[PDB]
Write a protein of this length. Structure first.
Length: 63
C-alpha cells in the first residue's frame, strides 16, 4: 500500500496503470494486487476508469 501510493504519486497525475502491469513489473502476486486495488480505490486513494480492466490513476479529482 505504501509502495503503490508512492509510485502512483511520483509518476504524474493523469497517468494510468493496469493491475497486470503492476503485478508483472514488481512481481507482486495478483492475489495481492486485487485485494489492495479494491481497498485503495474505495478509500478514495485511487480512481477507477469505466471497468476493472479499464485503468487506474491518482484520485480522479483534478483540474
Amino acid at each position: 500500500e505504501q509502495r503503490i501510493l508512492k509510485f502512483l504519486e511520483e509518476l504524474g497525475e493523469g497517468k494510468a496503470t493496469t493491475a497486470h502491469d503492476l503485478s508483472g513489473k514488481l512481481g507482486t502476486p495478483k492475489k495481492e494486487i486485487n485485494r489492495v486495488l479494491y481497498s485503495l480505490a474505495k478509500k478514495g486513494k485511487l480512481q477507477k476508469e469505466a471497468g476493472t480492466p479499464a485503468l487506474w490513476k491518482i484520485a480522479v479529482s483534478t483540474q
